[PDB]
Amino acid sequence: FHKIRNEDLIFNESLGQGTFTKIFKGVRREVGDYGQLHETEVLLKVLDKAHRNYSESFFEAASMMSKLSHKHLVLNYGVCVCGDENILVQEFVKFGSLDTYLKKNKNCINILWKLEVAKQLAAAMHFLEENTLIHGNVCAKNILLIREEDRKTGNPPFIKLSDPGISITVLPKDILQERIPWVPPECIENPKNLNLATDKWSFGTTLWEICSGGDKPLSALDSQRKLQFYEDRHQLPAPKAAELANLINNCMDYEPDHRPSFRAIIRDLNSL
Numbered sequence: 001f002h003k004i005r006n007e008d009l010i011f012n013e014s015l016g017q018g019t020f021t022k023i024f025k026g027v028r029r030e031v032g033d034y035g036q037l038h039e040t041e042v043l044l045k046v047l048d049k050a051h052r053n054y055s056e057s058f059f060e061a062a063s064m065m066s067k068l069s070h071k072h073l074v075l076n077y078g079v080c081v082c083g084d085e086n087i088l089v090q091e092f093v094k095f096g097s098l099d100t101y102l103k104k105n106k107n108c109i110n111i112l113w114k115l116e117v118a119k120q121l122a123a124a125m126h127f128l129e130e131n132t133l134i135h136g137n138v139c140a141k142n143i144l145l146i147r148e149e150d151r152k153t154g155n156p157p158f159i160k161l162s163d164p165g166i167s168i169t170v171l172p173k174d175i176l177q178e179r180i181p182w183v184p185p186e187c188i189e190n191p192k193n194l195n196l197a198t199d200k201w202s203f204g205t206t207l208w209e210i211c212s213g214g215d216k217p218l219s220a221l222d223s224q225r226k227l228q229f230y231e232d233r234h235q236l237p238a239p240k241a242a243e244l245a246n247l248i249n250n251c252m253d254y255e256p257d258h259r260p261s262f263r264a265i266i267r268d269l270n271s272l
C-alpha cells in the first residue's frame with residue numbers, strides 16, 4: 001500500500017458510516033503525471049479508534065481489492081497511518097453507493113437499468129471467481145455508481161464493487177446475525193465457512209436489493225427472527241418486479257455446492 005502523508009489530506013463532509021468506520025469526502029494534494037500538481041477528490045475511510053484492534057482486517061479487506069486491476073473494482077489510492085489514525089484512501093465516486101441511489105431514484109429505474117447493473121456486478125464477480133478471490137460482503141452498500149444512465153446517448157450506468165470492509169470471519173456474532181440475509185446460512189453456522197459460494201448467495205441478496213428499490217430484505221425481523229428465518233429454510237419473497245426472482249432464489253441456495261457459477265449466472269442474465 002502506498003503511504004500518504006496526513007498533511008496532504010483534507011477531510012471534508014461526512015458521507016456515511018460502515019462497520020466500525022466513518023466515511024468522508026476529502027482532497028489529496030499530490031504530484032501527478034508530468035509532474036503537475038493536483039488536488040484530487042478522494043474517499044477517506046476511517047477506522048474508529050475504539051476499534052483500532054481490527055486495523056489489520058480493515059486494511060486486508062482493501063488489499064484484496066488492490067491485488068487485481070479491473071474496470072469494475074474500486075481504485076485504492078493508498079493509506080494514511082500518521083498519528084493515531086487508520087485511514088483508507090480510495091477513489092471518490094460521484095453518485096455514491098447503490099443502496100441510497102436505489103432508494104432515492106426507485107421511481108425512475110426500470111428493468112433494463114437493473115439488468116445492466118446486474119450484468120456488470122456479475123462480471124465483477126466472475127472476474128473474482130476466475131481469480132479464486134473471495135469478496136465476503138457483496139451488498140448494494142458496497143456498489144458505487146460511477147456514471148448514471150443517459151438514454152439520450154444510449155449510455156448505460158456504470159458501477160464498481162467496493163471493498164468488503166472488516167471480514168465476517170472476525171466480526172462479532174450479533175453483527176453477523178444483523179447482516180442476515182447477506183451472510184449465507186453456512187457462515188452464520190460457522191464464519192470460517194467463508195468460501196466462493198458465499199459470494200453467490202450474497203450476490204442473490206444484492207439482486208433482491210436492486211430489484212426492490214432500496215428496501216432491505218427482512219428488515220422487519222430482529223436478529224432472533226432472522227436466525228429462525230434461516231432455521232426454517234425460507235427464501236426471500238419475489239420483488240414486485242420479479243423478473244430476476246428465479247435467479248435470486250437459485251443463487252440463494254441453502255446448499256452451497258449447488259449455487260451456480262457466475263458464468264452460468266451471466267448466461268442467465270443474457271437470456272433475459
Ligand SMILES: O=C(Nc1c[nH]nc1-c1nc2cc(CN3CCOCC3)ccc2[nH]1)NC1CC1
Nearest residue numbers: 015016017023043091092093094095096097162
Ligand atoms: O463506500 C461508500 N461511498 C463511496 C465510496 N467511494 N465514493 C463514495 C461516495 N460518494 C458519495 C457522494 C455522495 C453525494 N451524493 C451523491 C448522490 O447525489 C446526491 C449527493 C454521497 C455519498 C457518497 N459516497 N459508502 C457510502 C458512504 C456510505
